[PDB]
Amino acid sequence: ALPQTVRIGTDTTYAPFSSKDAKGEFIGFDIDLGNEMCKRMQVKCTWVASDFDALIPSLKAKKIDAIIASLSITDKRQQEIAFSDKLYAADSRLIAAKGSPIQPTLESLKGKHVGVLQGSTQEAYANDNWRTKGVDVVAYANQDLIYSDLTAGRLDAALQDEVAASEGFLKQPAGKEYAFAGPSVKDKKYFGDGTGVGLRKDDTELKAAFDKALTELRQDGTYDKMAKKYFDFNVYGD
């Protein structure tokens, strides 16, 4: 059976997907997606705020029943837990000066100076595809210096998470004359297969319910209406 009340864990420090408003209500695209799915599942859902690092432990311990918290669908996590179908993409993407012909390809990037955050999934992607193939990829301790190096012309391009740069640098005055260069880069190995509802492996009925609700709210246009509140692009991806 479904939970009487599905307890859904999230970390409310990640706008525009999950945060708290002035009245202490949970808000964001993750919250809209969860609530809409729950409505169609005809189950009660209670949101539970905690730190992201505690979510999978809480799920395994049955303190909560589901995770919606921009949780990447990784093969490593798939070994321990289950996921719904993709909620939206969490891919990376290059940023360069407006008008730049740069593409996220080895051919385009040879001769270029690319910056990436040290220790990141973006760094790993850039390492295997670009740096070891001869592209000047330089790793940074701090994202802020990546962006100030880009605007100063020290860097030609920066490889970042797509949505975070879209909400951050590209909407700040310093990023006004900058733009994504080429399409997002997609690879489950480095970036996962999108985000999804995190679930216990044996709760197959609950997975079936979330997946059914998601398919239905996507095909009747509710997904796109909800996403448009936060995003002016195809956040779902491919």
Curated annotation (Swiss-Prot):
Which of UniProt's keywords are assigned here?
Amino-acid transport, Disulfide bond, Periplasm, Signal, Transport
A Pfam family annotated for this UniProt entry: SBP_bac_3
Q: Which organism is it from?
A: Salmonella typhimurium (strain LT2 / SGSC1412 / ATCC 700720)
Provide the residue positions that the database annotates as binding L-lysine: 11, 70, 72, 77, 121
Q: List the disulfide bonds.
A: 38-45
Q: Which domain of life is it from?
A: Bacteria
GO CC annotation, single: outer membrane-bounded periplasmic space
Record note on domains: Has a bi-lobal structure. Contains two globular domains separated by a deep cleft wherein the ligand-binding site is located.
Q: How changing residue 30 to A affects the protein?
A: Shows a drastic decrease in arginine and histidine binding affinity
Q: Which family does it belong to?
A: Belongs to the bacterial solute-binding protein 3 family.
- Per UniProt, where does L-arginine bind? 11, 69-70, 72, 77, 121, 161
Residues reported to bind L-ornithine:
11, 69-70, 72, 77, 121, 161
Entry's SUPFAM superfamilies? Periplasmic binding protein-like II (SSF53850)
Q: Which PANTHER family match?
A: LYSINE_ARGININE_ORNITHINE-BINDING PERIPLASMIC PROTEIN, MEMBRANE-BOUND LYTIC MUREIN TRANSGLYCOSYLASE F
SMART domains from the xrefs? PBPb
The outcome of changing residue 52 to A is: Shows a drastic decrease in arginine and histidine binding affinity
Keyword Signal tagged? yes
UniProt main location, coarse: periplasm
What's the reported outcome of changing residue 77 to A? Shows a drastic decrease in arginine and histidine binding affinity
* InterPro entries linked to this entry: Lys_Arg_Orn-bd (IPR005768), SBP_3_CS (IPR018313), Solute-binding_3/MltF_N (IPR001638)
Q: According to its UniProt record, where is this protein located?
A: Periplasm
Entry's NCBIfam families?
Answer: 3A0103s03R, PRK15010.1
Please give the function described in this protein's UniProt entry: Part of the ABC transporter complex HisPMQ-ArgT involved in lysine/arginine/ornithine transport. Binds lysine, arginine and ornithine. Can also bind histidine, with much lower affinity. Stimulates ATPase activity of HisP.
Q: How does it assemble?
A: The complex is composed of two ATP-binding proteins (HisP), two transmembrane proteins (HisM and HisQ) and a solute-binding protein (ArgT).
**Gene for this protein?**
argT
Residue ranges crossing the lipid bilayer per the database entry: none
Mutating residue 117 to K: what's the consequence? Changes ligand specificity. Can bind glutamine. Still able to bind basic amino acids, however, with 1000-fold less affinity for arginine
Please state what the protein is called.
Answer: Lysine/arginine/ornithine-binding periplasmic protein
